[PDB]
């Protein structure tokens, strides 16, 4: 199918609550950032993963500081951007997605004003 199961990490089937913040960010870039045209296939999808990385910072920071993704333009070099965020919050590579952030992620997938996400994040009632 043209919409893969999102929470599949390098061929390994799994669920959204059994991915790490890194795995999700890398899966996001994988499926929305078109490598061949070095371009985010849709600006909302770049906007999406930005909102997500921002959340990564929010969760894992201890005190208040300022975002390492000041502008989402920085996502135009996705790999470099991702490494910047997770370098600062290394812990985020090792921990599964917080239960409450799962709800969040799935909520963003439901945002109108965004090109419908190119996958299935969840097996549930609205699976059709």
122: left (phi over 0), alpha (psi -120 to 50) or beta: beta
Asked if 64 is part of the footprint of another protein (rule: CB under 8 A), the reply reads: yes
Task: Among 49, 57, 75, 78, indicate the residue that binds another protein (CB under 8 A).
Answer: 57
Asked if 9 is part of the footprint of another protein (rule: CB under 8 A), the reply reads: no
Taking the least distance from each CB to another protein, the nearer of 2 and 10 is: 10
* Neighbour tally for 116: CB within 10 Å: 12
Kindly state the smallest distance separating residue 37's Cβ from another protein, in Å: 26
Asked if 10 is part of the footprint of another protein (rule: CB under 8 A), the reply reads: no
Asked if 123 is part of the footprint of another protein (rule: CB under 8 A), the reply reads: no
Separation CA 41–CA 32 (nearest Å): 6
**Using a CB cutoff of 8 Å and minimum separation of 24, what contacts does 51-55 make?**
51/108, 52/24, 52/25, 52/28, 52/105, 52/108, 53/25, 53/81, 53/82, 53/85, 55/101, 55/104
Separation CA 108–CA 28 (nearest Å): 13
Task: Among 47, 98, 109, 120, indicate the residue that binds another protein (CB under 8 A).
Answer: 98
Instruction: List binders of another protein among 22-51 (CB under 8 A).
Output: none
Candidates 21-29, 62-70, 77-85, 120-128 — which segment interacts with another protein by CB under 8 A?
62-70
State whether residue 117 is helix, strand or coil: coil
Asked if 59 is part of the footprint of another protein (rule: CB under 8 A), the reply reads: yes
Site of interaction with another protein (CB under 8 A):
17-18, 54, 57-67, 70, 94-96, 98-100, 103-104, 107, 110
């Amino acid at each position: 199918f043209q919409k893969p199961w999102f929470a599949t990490v390098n061929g390994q089937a799994r669920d959204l609550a059994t991915m790490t913040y890194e795995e999700v960010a890398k899966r996001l870039v994988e499926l929305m950032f078109i490598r061949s045209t070095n371009s985010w296939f849709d600006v909302t999808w770049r906007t999406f993963t930005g909102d997500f990385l921002r959340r990564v910072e929010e969760r894992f920071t201890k005190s208040k500081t300022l975002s390492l993704i000041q502008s989402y333009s920085l996502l135009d070099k996705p790999d470099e951007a991702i490494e910047k965020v997770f370098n600062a919050y290394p812990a985020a590579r090792e921990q599964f997605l917080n239960a409450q952030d799962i709800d969040h992620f799935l909520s963003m997938c439901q945002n109108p004003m965004q090109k419908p996400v190119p996958f299935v994040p969840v097996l549930d009632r609205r699976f059709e």
